[model samples]
Target: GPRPRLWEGQDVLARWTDGLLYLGTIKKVDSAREVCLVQFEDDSQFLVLWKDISPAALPGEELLCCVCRSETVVPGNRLVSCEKCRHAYHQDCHVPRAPAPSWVCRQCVFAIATKRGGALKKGPYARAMLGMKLSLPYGLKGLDWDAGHLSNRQQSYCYCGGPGEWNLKMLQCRSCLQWFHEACTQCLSKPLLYGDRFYEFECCVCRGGPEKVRRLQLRWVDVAHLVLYHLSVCCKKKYFDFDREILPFTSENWDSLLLGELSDTPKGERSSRLLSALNSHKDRFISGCLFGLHARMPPPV
Candidate 1:
């Protein structure tokens, strides 16, 4: 077989002598030593011997890049590693901007978000369940969220095309548990109303689609609780303290309405009625609210 040509400036993924994978741009190729110096976006460099070098086929931005595999250019331009999983990618590749304080990779997010059973796995969530206080939001106070490390949940963007953030409101499909913003889901309205428990909720895609019959069924009440829980965490930061002018309903009013509805109705009917009431207000749950939120965030002057 012909010897492979290693050129400078070419992107390469190699296995280091330590048995770890590396992705970087070739800086200098020493033909005499059969070794190449590669530069990664994270400012780390490695010398890969020719015998250990090979071509890497990386997926584009659409698919998940698990740091070392599937994506070329490990620690590529503007990449950040998940404090938990240690997976790395460009800020834009997963969630835009490095997560402040604590961050979890998408896989871990999905796993944590979807775990309904009482038992928990190892890592942040498991640690959280075991009452291990590793960081704030769980233990100590006054710590910077961005300063701490945290650790996925198939991730889906809201129909409005926004990624899930704690500060925003979201809805999840009962069947698949895939998440979307309350503002983006079409079946529900804004200035939401509530009814009693057992009220079932179905996503638009699941209600009328040919495969609707086969999809998983979930209660609207359960979905609502989860969305509120996610928002509560996100709302702790000012970045998510959205202006009332942009949302269909005020957070205070939404909170008041849910409390009133839940208080008035029996626990069983609360979820169901809440879904119904929100459906009635569906006209108020403005479309493109996610986009409106995006429009508000401009680069700092």
Candidate 2:
């Protein structure tokens, strides 16, 4: 029952009592009279009560933010839609930054993940089908999965979560055997070559999990080794924070206190043990670096 603070230049939709939807922009708000002057898509103008404005309507091709549920998503508060379902949310709702090309919405992602387990009444594929079905929005209530357009292997939905008809150039997944558009996959990262040899392909879901984890673990191990080696070199050269007189480094005792505290092993294996310790605890060590722990710890000295 509270009155919305209507402003000029705000995009809105006014639904008539007869069920007509008018996508419009508010040109002026007469606060004294509690009315707004709206100019619609057809260039027609109307003075409507602010209460009649629908927050869910799309004023143009621009989408409404699912966060604040508003059409006036500012420059910094831009709307980002799911690439799969076309459902939109605010940029801040995603993160403090803009989404990457491969970023899918939480709903679409949940649907996709859920599809891996069992049947789904609505999934990424379902949304894509709905997007194709409602190409021209007429407020239709139901969709037929068995419809003629929804049939045929090449004409059916693609595995990339897009309509297959958009790009007639589609390929089948060698693993799942599902049809997909090559442009929608990582294959688009580079130009394809024609050869006498047959190349195999796999979808991200099928091929990414184990390989990605192994790759990341190897990368982190390598990085940890490099960081430890660099720190040791810095300590040997007296190039560390203590030498530079940084905070928590006014006394040489800090080095002995931190380094000796690091190793519980025999002094003969202390250096090796310390390197292994540093590598094993690299994440915590890196975090400590931000808190001046790097200034506290010195090499074997």
Candidate 3:
């Protein structure tokens, strides 16, 4: 019915616009025919073609924050140009990233127009999964890890905010903060001590185990694939995608972890499906979507 609002009135302007454009900067760029690249003050970039614009492009900054008539300027509060909208952004803020091809501007990226109709707007998660490499830290690949091997913290009293503190001897999970007795589990029989890293420990309710579970902070690069995806994708945005070309193939002889009972395959089945998708598309898909779509560069394959 009506043109939907993409950015929920977020200020996205063109930097060059002395004060006309939304967000940051807007200029008549010669990079493309009938298409001008709008660089917002925040560095959230927008590639506006003639057709997408209700009004024609002009010299210098002719754009303004579509909602507010505020004059958009460079580095506006650490706002970078994005594919969604030329809005200001605090770097490391927002998901699906606004840098490079991710700079679809708020309208295109957020799909604000479709949001009004109650349509599920595509997000960073969808795009991120398009050609992503999936991996886990458990028993799989060359990195074999047994979830049972990890223990929890021991607690003398049931600190579960119960009526009384039962002097129980068991381990608890630092991650989920759940308590389990050492005798109940098969892995750890001794009381586990708490450590800096994530491991099992003893709890008051549960029996002795490996050790108290501790989550050690990891660098962005060192973080596992699934962990990063959960943090950057599910938590930050509904969608995201990453490079999967670097993933390796595993032989049928490889063993996998068994987590959920819903799947008929195995624990690593989700990962296997993802890898299979990448293998099916091979070079063209990655090149067309990831490299070409984002960087405006051709696919290496």
- Highest TM-score: give the candidate number: 1
- The model with the greater lDDT, 1 or 2, is 2
> Between the candidate structures 2 and 3, which one is better when assessed by TM-score?
2
Model 2 agreement with the true structure over 33-91: per-residue lDDT tens digits = 66688899889887876545544433353466654657676666677776655657777
TM-score, candidate number 1: 0.23
State TM-scores per candidate: 0.23, 0.23, 0.18
lDDT order, best first, reads 2, 1, 3
> What is the full ranking by TM-score, best candidate first?
1, 2, 3
Q: Model 3: per-residue lDDT, tens digit, 1-301?
A: 1443222223333212110134434454433364456655566676654323333222432343333333453452334544433454433333323352144443342232212112232455334322111211111223222364332222111121111111122344443344433222223322322111223344422322222333233321222222222223223332234344222212221122111232244545545454444335433223332211222111121
Per-candidate Cα lDDT values, in order, are: 0.39, 0.41, 0.31
Please write out the lDDT profile of model 1 over residues 164-241, one tens digit for every residue.
432233334455333333333333323222211222344444444311212122334333433333343434321221
Clash counts for all predictions: 34, 0, 84
Candidate 2 contains a number of clashing pairs equal to 0
